[model samples]
Target: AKLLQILNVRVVGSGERVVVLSHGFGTDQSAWSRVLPYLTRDHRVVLYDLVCAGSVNPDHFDFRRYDNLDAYVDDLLAILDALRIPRCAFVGHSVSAMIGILASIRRPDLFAKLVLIGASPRFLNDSDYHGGFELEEIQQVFDAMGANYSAWATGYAPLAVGADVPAAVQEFSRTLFNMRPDISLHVCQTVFKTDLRGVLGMVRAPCVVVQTTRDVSVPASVAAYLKAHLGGRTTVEFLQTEGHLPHLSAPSLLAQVLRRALARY
Candidate 1:
């Protein structure tokens, strides 16, 4: 109960099957709102704020503790243990996707399957790797965030959402703005600098990589890379949408894909 409360864990719906929805950076559990209706209908849904999420208590976010993704992995494992979730399907977006991947590798028995949305093992481009951003460009992003987070959020929300949906952009902006600037910068730095490519081959759980046709943050090549590198049986599913946050920008479409993916496990 203590862990659940601290993480702002909410359990909803009625079903024998459990599904955990983990949001990425700049958003809290509410980022799953658009897809919750569809999931809750057929499965028990678990949602929680990441330690650094705006909804979470800042005091709980220890930069020293969460120095790497392993710490987040431990938190996720503890949460599942606290909730007595022996095994569940996990749906993770962006950074949380990598978190889920690591958790599954650490405790493979805890996960029945994994659905990774807009996931990237690395964001920085290297020789023979198309992870997307260049180091200088990422530095520019950090500079902008450090200079002024508000203006950065204002400009980033639209581009990340990648659609004409004003409401979705506004929602993304709200979550981005809600985060503490220093914490946001810290999380961004952690996420971009992370390189989980080598670890992908260690994951044994079945995985479904979900990707948008066009995402400024994650290129299509990343999805193909994930499918090829993941140790378990993996498949890539492309949403016809054109945004990083398909759950927000194309809820219905995402729900359909999620339903199909969930049905597999």
Candidate 2:
């Protein structure tokens, strides 16, 4: 209970199989709230905020420890152990999706099928890799963050969430602004610099890559890359959606896709 409290883990619904819903960067578990109702009816659901999130106890976040993404992988494994859950279907968005993959690799007993939404192994281009951005482009983002965090957050909110609805953009902006400036910079630097292409094949569990049609953050090529490299039975689902934040912008559509996807495994 203490551990769950520390992570602010919320266990909802009940069933034979458990589904752990992991949120992406710049947001908390609340990002999964819209998708929860769709999942709870049939499967036991788990939700939790990241240590560095606004909803989390700020003191618990150790800057030095969180400089790299591995700390998040550790938290994921710890969360599973605390719940005494032997195995679960892992569903994650953006960075959390890769974190789930790394955790699954480390502790295969903790995960079953992997549903990765708008996930990317690398966000910067590497010659023929085509990760959608140049090194200079990502670096400029960091520079912009350092210069004026608030302005960057406001400007980035719509870009990250995409221009679908006013509500989704506002929500993304709120969460983006809520993040500590330093923490936000560190997470962005950490995430954009990360390269998980080699590690994708290490995952033994089946994977489903949920992609958005119109995303400046994640390109269609990256989805194809994930499908090609992911070791186990891998498939791709491209939703003809207009935003990067599908769960927020298109909840019902996202839920419908998730329902069918979950039913498979």
Candidate 3:
């Protein structure tokens, strides 16, 4: 399949176990850079970019193929197969978290445990659910990208992290915006429209949910909700960090959370 032909990953540090870090939407492997130095001393860290993300081969992008998140999940799985990494501790942020979970469910032997950081099964608020943003608002983001792509990337994307966003964040937003405009729009549509609530009952690995106190990307309530839904024995823990990108905002605190989560295994 073309999936394995268009993937990339890296391994760092030295240890008996393999720890894979999959970043969230709109950012790359550097999102894990801050926490790597601390944990790599004791663990072997695995890092990679999702298709159309990070420094990966954007040329392989078939926008129609990635119309849904499952396609990205397939890409991640293909990369694991290519690397011959049989099993790993997967730490996925935002959208990548569920992608990892889905991959784990299909290949239970591939994941030792799953750490979903700032995760949300669904981001749109429903009458019976509490995802906060409505489908209409999510559509607004989609339409903006479909229309004036630069405005959504250079204009609206920055506001997600707010005015005080750091240089790293600003740079990330810029690059994420520059992604193929149509693909970017579809990805956001996939993020908001798809709800993995029912699939949580299928997760097989022991899972840990990490929440940032007041993250702009994922609210604490969503993390609690995801914890309650996951199929296996799952724990929801919160850090005192303020930003959505806790690894970047407070790596030391993230390192602590990593230690605690590892103890669960």
Candidate 4:
């Protein structure tokens, strides 16, 4: 009971097909608010705040139990089981995108398809992987975040959300502000340090990688990388935005593209 409560799950709209929206690390389920109208029209929309996010009781967060991203995959699976959902089309952002991938691999019958936004199999640039950041820079991120969490979030939120839209930046900052600094840092470390390339080929469900322009976190190249490696069918949809969070920065555009992408599956 407590474990399910930690998920803070909610269901909306009604349809034969299910659509599950999984939010990223820094934000909660509300991150998909703007795009909900687009998703809820003909499908049962499911939303939930990740255990490390929203207002989940801190006491329920066991660091050891969640030391890795697989714990989150398990968390998502548990929610689906509780809801009695046999299968659903999934849309995930940032770390949640990778989480969805793992979940799809774990229980292929539970997922019909996937739409991954701002996803990267790896964040550290390996010999030729170009995962985006360097080891030194990654360490510096943690160091700076540790030094002054408030400042880190204020600065990082804009960079993560992109610069053109002030309102989007403010919304991103507000969500970042709502998170516990410790949890945010921990999630960041776990998310950025992860490498999911090994398991991409294990995913049987079809996937669409949503790539955003000028995203500091996930480069456009990573989308191609994901497509090349995934086991099942894969495609890419480019969103002309300058942020890591396009579903928030450009919801309408994201929604339109997602509709087209989902049609393919």
The residue-by-residue lDDT of candidate 4 on 1-265, one tens digit each, is: 3556678888998888898999987788888899888867778988998988846766677778888899999888888888889989999998888899899999998889999988888888988788889889989989988899889888888888874788888888887888777787888888876889999999999998887778888766898899999988998888766789887788999999877766534
The residue-by-residue lDDT of candidate 1 on 77-195, one tens digit each, is 99889888898999999999989999999999989899998799998898999988998898999999999999999999999999899999999999999999989998989998799
Off by over 4 Å in 1: none
Candidate 3 lDDT, tens digit per residue, 1-265? 3544445567789776778899877777777877888778777787877776736666677778887788888877777787777888889988898788888888888988999886888888777887768767777777777878876777654445443547756666756765677656667777877788888888889999987767666666787677778888888877865666676656788888887676534
Error of 4 at 215 (Å): 0.7
For each candidate in turn, give its C-alpha RMSD to the true structure in angstroms: 0.9, 1.3, 2.3, 1.3
Model 4 TM-score relative to the real fold: 0.96
What's the lDDT for residue 264 in model 2? 49
Best by TM-score: 1
Off by over 4 Å in 2: none
TM, every model? 0.98, 0.96, 0.89, 0.96
List ranges where model 3 is wrong by over 4 Å: 1-5, 156-159, 162-165
